[PDB]
Each structure stands twice: as structure tokens, then as C-alpha cells.
């Protein structure tokens, strides 16, 4: 018995076709993805293959002005139109709180929405009851396939789920559900979830009964053979894990932003055991035409978005690199741009002995969501910017001791290599890491720009000295695991809205050209 697993993850409001880098589509002929093109491929597969399942591993929410305006109603509608069979909850599904998930996605979906490691409490228990499920047994031909969801244990620090949602460890929560499914005579079980390639590998290895793991979060690209685009594979497709009970469990992820469609053909024996697994993500390029009906629908919905696509903020003569492969790994010129705008906003004239009250900036790479292309006469529009900073947050002023900030830079890279959001971008700071060192001891050099000086220059960070830092409210609140900031900060003053601060600076500058200049160095 052969099942075809079609899967997406981390679509992040990429409803329309995009450029190769996921930014706004300019030259349509070189454009990729979008729900209208995905529909065409999905329909073609359904016609050729007898047993098909279309799955989403979370993070459909947040990414472009589609989400800013439609707040999840476009997700429900277009996922229903593509006829998804199931969806696991990602972290960004809580960006607008529980209420923003329940309405509209949970109530409007025509497919089950899953987690299992999310437990509601207090008044929420009855309010969310039956709207999300730990698993769902789905009929596929003459057979049944159990799908069991999971969401990152880290979601309370990455999004806004609130206090009445408890995020249990994934492996601990999954084992009883899979065990229960086997007692209800379900022998083919898919683990669909949003926790990251490392966790997916652990689920495959530790949760007895899981036939195949379909993941997300880490934007992991896996491929068998020579890849078709700019993405570099982290491993083969599928990634084979050997379970503690001695079974070969395939692990799959389909990169992000609907560029690729995950495709995995599994051959199962009568007892529900995986005999073989093969496949590859399908590059959704201009060769695959967009569905005319879905395109007409996307266009109907695109009208309410157009009043933000106009007015030029300024120009850039350089490519603004807001790609996660860059910003979550090393110094990125978009990072330097946003930090330069952050410092520029806080220029306050007082005291002869201070050139300015604040010289330092820190920004997590997980906060930078998109690059901006310079090739359409270098124009930067509000829309272009709204894909980079979509969260509607503020850039705040904090008082931090040198030790707190040193701990912050250690956290920044404590698990470097997993494409996690905590990697810090900087302004008025020159940091040097030795990643070959043990976590908690990777910062080898940390120099900061002076404030109590007439000529600003870099001096080494002092542990007992209190420094003023411009930083997003998300980090000030202990987001991305920056608990030491929330706990040890000496003062916290809220500032201006994130997108406004960067638009104002782009407008003041008229023509920008940020470089990667050595603010962050490794070895």
C-alpha cells in the first residue's frame, strides 16, 4: 500500500508567487510558489496517485500584508480551496493570541488542526474544546492513517499564546497518543508538527509507533541529488533516523515560503510498517502554471492590499539581505540597517559630557523576516518593509549591566547551527565568537561604542558597568529565551513602532547602502 505525502511548512503569508528569495514578485517569469501554482501541482498529483495526503507543518500565519490585513482569514480560505487534509499548529499561529487563532483559522478550517502537546486551562478549556485535536484518524482509500500533531515547547517565548495554554514536552505528550492510536487498530502513523529538524529527529528516534515525521520551524531543506535552486540541502530527502526500537523512520521538511512542495512516496506492508521511502521537494517554478480560478480569487482579495503597495519610502542601491540563512547565522546588512535606524531614532540632546545617551543596539535575527530587492529602480515601499517587520512591535530603551549583555551574547549563539531566531544583530557593538568553544563561553571579544565621550570610539565591555541599549520590546519581555534581559534589566522605557522607525530612517537617508562591515566576527 503506497501513500503520497504532499507537505508544506513555514508558508508565512506567501499567498502570491514570490521572487526566488521569497520577497515581492517583480519579474513574474522568474517567480515561484503561491497557492495558485501549488493548487495546480497538488491537483496533478491527486489525478496520478491513488492515495494522497496534503499536510501543513505550521507557520502559515505572519509574513506579508496579506496577514496584516486579513489576519488569518486568507489562510483558512486558501488552505480550504487547496483541500488540505490536516494542519499542525506552528508558533506563529499564536501571534494574534488564542482569540486570533480560534477566529478565523480554527472555526473556518475544513480540515483538522492538531497539536497534542498543547493543553488549555481555566476559562479557555471550554472555549477551545474540540477546535484543535491531539490527532485525527483519516480515511485514505480502503485504509486509515493516524496523524498526530505537535508544536514547539518554546512557543510561550516566541509568540503570544497567553497564560491558559500549557506547552508540554513533545516526546512525553506524543507517546500516549501514538500508543492509544495503536490500540484503536491504526498501524500507519504520521507525526506532523512544528518544533524544528533537531526535535523531529528526536521524535523519530524516541516516540515508539511513529512511522514518518513531517516537520517545520527550522526552514530545513533536504534533497536527494543535485538541488534545483539556491538552497543548500542540510541532508538527504528523506532523512533516515534509526529509532531506539531499531526501526528506520523517514524525517521530512520542505524548506519555507511555499517555494517547494514536499513529495514523499511511502510503501507500507499489510501491518503498517514502512518498506521503502523515496521522493524530493518539488520546485514550484514558472513551468508549473498558476491555477486560473485560484489566481482570479487571489486577485479579488489583493484589491484591499494595494493602498500599501504604493508610495516609495526611499531607495537602496544594495540588496537588503534579510534572509534567515544570513541574519540567523552572521552579520546581515538588513540587521545593520535596522540597528542604525534604532540608534538614529534615540538621538537626544543633553549633557556636554555625552555625545548621545545611547550608542548600543541589539536585534534578534528571528525578528528580520524578509530581504528587500534593489532591482525595481531601488524602491522601498511600506509593503516591502511590512514583510521585514510584520509584528507591530516597538524599539525600546533598556539599562543593562555588562554581565547581562555578555550573557545575552552567549545565549545568542548557545546552540548555533539550527537556524534559531535568538542570533543577535548589532549596532554600536563589535563582538567576536569562537563557536568551537563550549556554550556559555563562546564570546571571545566584546567591545562597545562609548556614550560619556565627545568622540565615539570602541572600548571593551565592563561587567559591572550599566549600558543603555535600544532593543525590540519582544527581547525586553524575555522573548527568544532572553530571560536574563527581562530579569536583570535596570530600567525599561517603551519606544516608537518598529516599522515607523525604519521607514523614517529610510526617508531621512533617501538613498541607503548598508554593508557587512565586521560588527560580528567568528574564526
Amino acid at each position: 500500500w503506497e501513500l503520497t505525502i504532499l507537505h508544506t511548512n513555514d508558508v508565512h503569508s506567501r499567498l502570491e508567487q514570490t521572487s526566488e528569495d521569497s520577497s515581492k514578485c517583480v519579474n513574474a517569469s522568474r517567480c515561484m510558489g503561491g497557492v495558485a501554482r501549488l493548487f495546480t501541482k497538488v491537483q496533478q498529483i491527486r489525478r496520478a496517485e491513488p492515495n494522497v495526503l496534503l499536510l501543513d507543518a505550521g507557520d502559515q500565519y505572519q509574513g506579508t500584508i496579506w496577514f496584516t490585513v486579513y489576519k488569518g482569514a486568507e489562510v483558512a480560505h486558501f488552505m480550504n480551496a487547496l483541500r488540505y487534509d490536516a494542519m499542525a499548529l506552528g508558533n506563529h499561529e499564536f501571534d494574534n493570541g488564542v482569540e486570533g487563532l480560534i477566529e478565523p483559522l480554527l472555526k473556518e478550517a475544513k480540515f483538522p488542526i492538531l497539536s497534542a502537546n498543547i493543553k488549555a486551562k481555566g476559562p479557555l478549556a471550554s472555549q477551545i474544546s474540540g477546535l484543535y485535536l491531539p490527532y485525527k484518524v483519516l480515511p485514505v482509500g480502503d485504509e486509515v492513517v493516524g496523524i498526530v500533531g505537535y508544536t514547539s515547547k518554546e512557543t510561550p517565548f516566541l509568540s503570544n499564546p497567553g497564560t491558559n495554554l500549557v506547552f508540554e514536552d513533545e516526546i512525553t505528550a506524543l507517546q500516549p497518543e501514538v500508543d492509544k492510536l495503536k490500540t484503536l487498530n491504526v498501524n500507519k502513523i504520521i507525526a506532523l508538527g512544528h518544533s524544528g529538524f533537531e526535535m523531529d529527529k528526536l521524535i523519530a528516534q524516541k516516540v515508539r509507533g511513529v512511522d514518518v515525521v513531517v516537520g517545520g520551524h527550522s526552514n530545513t531543506f533536504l534533497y536527494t541529488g543535485n538541488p534545483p535552486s539556491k538552497e543548500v540541502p542540510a541532508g538527504k530527502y528523506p532523512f533516515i533516523v534509526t529509532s531506539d526500537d531499531g526501526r528506520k523512520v523517514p524525517v521530512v521538511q520542505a524548506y519555507a515560503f511555499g517555494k517547494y512542495l514536499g513529495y514523499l512516496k511511502i510503501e507500507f506492508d499489510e501491518r503498517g510498517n514502512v518498506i521503502s521511502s523515496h521522493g524530493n521537494p518539488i520546485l514550484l517554478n514558472s513551468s508549473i502554471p498558476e491555477d486560473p480560478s485560484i489566481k482570479a480569487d487571489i486577485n479579488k482579495w489583493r484589491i484591499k492590499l494595494d493602498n500599501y503597495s504604493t508610495q516609495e519610502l526611499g531607495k537602496t542601491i544594495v540588496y537588503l539581505d534579510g534572509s534567515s540563512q544570513s541574519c540567523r547565522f552572521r552579520e546581515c546588512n538588513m540587521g545593520n540597517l535596522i540597528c542604525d535606524a534604532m540608534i538614529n531614532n534615540n538621538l537626544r540632546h543633553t549633557d556636554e559630557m555625552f555625545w548621545n545617551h545611547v550608542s548600543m543596539c541589539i536585534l534578534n535575527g528571528g525578528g528580520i523576516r524578509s530581504p528587500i530587492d534593489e532591482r525595481n529602480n531601488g524602491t522601498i515601499t511600506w509593503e516591502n518593509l511590512a514583510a521585514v517587520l510584520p509584528f507591530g512591535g516597538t524599539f525600546d530603551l533598556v539599562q543593562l549591566k555588562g554581565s547581562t549583555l555578555k550573557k545575552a551574547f552567549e545565549h545568542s549563539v548557545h546552540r548555533y547551527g539550527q537556524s534559531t531566531g535568538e542570533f543577535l544583530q548589532v549596532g554600536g557593538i563589535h563582538v567576536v565568537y569562537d563557536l568551537s568553544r563550549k556554550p556559555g563561553d563562546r564570546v571571545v571579544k566584546l567591545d562597545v561604542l562609548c556614550t560619556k565621550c565627545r568622540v565615539p570610539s570602541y572600548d571593551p565591555l565592563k561587567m559591572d558597568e550599566v549600558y543603555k541599549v535600544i532593543l525590540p520590546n519582544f527581547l525586553a519581555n524575555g522573548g527568544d529565551g532572553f530571560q536574563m534581559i527581562k530579569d536583570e534589566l535596570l530600567r525599561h522605557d517603551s519606544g516608537d513602532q518598529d516599522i515607523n522607525v525604519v521607514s523614517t530612517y529610510i526617508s531621512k537617508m533617501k538613498v541607503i547602502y548598508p554593508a557587512v562591515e565586521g560588527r560580528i566576527k567568528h574564526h
Partner: antibody
């Protein structure tokens, strides 16, 4: 508060057609499928069909293939059920219903019912 | 898919535990719902996903089962429970049970 209000009782001759209305208030009408079910005296609740009020696409129970037509007026937040070639067997209480969610047919919301009497 | 309800009719005193069954002609997973219907009224949703209780339905009402054999219970029969109860499946298309009329002994 999510209310479904149906057109009143009808009496139709065998051979005639009937069009029952269902006005939805309390939620975005176009965003959820609307179900039509009926209850004939001592016969058990029978599904008629459902419609997606966004595009007017519907799925029907095979028993009424070419007899029932499901439509809607988006601007009026109203769903229509038209049953033609009326037989005495269509003497039933006609209901429009909506799910707790758009996934399953767990009818949390029902219309008051519309009695259609097929007699000469 | 046919949904067959046995007991079909039953009488019980106030405070009693009442159990009614619904049998599906084939496996319906947990895709079963239960409704309460009073004479001149529309049915009220009580239980969905075979065991999940709908919003204001009292804790004395419960459901159980997985594929084929289904159960509905009133753990403390009250005079307001005087109705016909229907089971339903939404696995293949949509079918209902023929009902169970509940009457109370007084």
C-alpha cells in the same frame, strides 16, 4: 448570537417545487458551509446537501440527484433550498444547519424548521 | 453507512443512570455526534467526536466509543431530559439514527 431564520410553512401540490429560505446572522455568512437536512414523520433525520456560500458550490445527497438545487444571496446572508417534482414523501420539516466549526457536521446551530406539506 | 439505535424507547425514574446505544454499519472512527430533540423544536447538539461535550451541556451527559460501537449516558436522569435522542456519523457522507424516546417513571 448565530441565528438561522427560515421562511414559514408551505403547502404544495404533487409535481410542484418549493423554495425554503434560511437567513443567517451573528457571523460572516460567506465563510461557513450551510447544511440542509429534513425530518419526515417517523422516518429519521435525512441529509439533503450543503453549499459553500462563497462560490455557490454544493454537494448533494444522491437520493435527490436532479431534484434539489441549493443557492444563496450573499448580500442578504440567505441560503436557498429548492426541491422540485414534489412527491407526498416530501411532506417533512426542512432544516438549515451550521456546524460548531467548518470541518465537521456537528450541528450546533439550526433553523426553526419549515414544514412542507405535499398534498392535492 | 447505517446508524442503528437500540434501545429504541425506554423509561427510567428520576436520578437513574440511562445508557443508549448506536451501532454503525462500518467503522466511523470517533466521527459520531448525539442530539436531543423535543417535540416542536429542532435538535440540540449534545456530544461530538463520540465523547466531547458541546458548550453548555451539563456534565451528567456523556458519550463513548470508537468505530462501530457507540454509547450515550445520562448519569442522573432529570425531568428536563424528556426527549428523543439521535446519534449521527460524519465519516463517509451524513447519516442519522432512528432515535431513542426517553420517558420518565413517576
Amino acid at each position: 448570537q448565530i441565528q438561522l431564520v427560515q421562511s414559514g410553512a408551505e403547502v404544495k401540490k404533487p409535481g410542484a417545487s418549493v423554495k425554503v429560505s434560511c437567513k443567517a446572522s451573528g457571523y460572516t455568512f460567506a465563510s461557513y458551509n450551510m447544511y440542509w437536512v429534513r425530518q419526515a414523520p417517523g422516518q429519521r433525520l435525512e441529509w439533503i446537501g450543503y453549499i459553500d456560500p462563497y462560490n455557490g458550490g454544493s454537494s448533494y445527497n444522491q437520493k435527490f440527484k436532479g431534484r434539489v438545487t441549493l443557492t444563496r444571496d450573499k448580500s442578504a446572508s440567505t441560503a436557498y433550498m429548492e426541491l422540485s417534482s414534489l412527491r407526498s414523501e416530501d411532506t417533512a420539516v426542512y432544516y438549515c444547519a451550521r456546524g460548531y466549526n467548518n470541518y465537521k457536521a456537528w450541528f450546533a446551530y439550526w433553523g426553526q424548521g419549515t414544514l412542507v406539506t405535499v398534498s392535492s | 453507512i447505517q446508524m442503528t439505535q437500540s434501545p429504541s424507547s425506554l423509561s427510567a425514574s428520576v436520578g437513574d443512570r440511562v445508557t443508549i446505544t448506536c451501532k454503525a454499519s462500518q467503522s466511523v472512527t470517533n466521527d459520531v455526534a448525539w442530539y436531543q430533540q423535543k417535540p416542536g423544536k429542532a435538535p440540540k447538539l449534545l456530544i461530538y467526536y463520540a465523547s466531547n461535550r458541546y458548550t453548555g451541556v451539563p456534565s451528567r451527559f456523556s458519550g463513548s466509543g470508537y468505530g462501530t460501537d457507540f454509547t450515550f449516558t445520562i448519569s442522573s436522569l432529570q425531568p428536563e431530559d424528556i426527549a428523543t435522542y439521535y446519534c449521527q456519523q460524519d465519516y463517509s457522507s451524513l447519516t442519522f439514527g432512528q432515535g431513542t424516546k426517553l420517558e420518565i417513571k413517576r
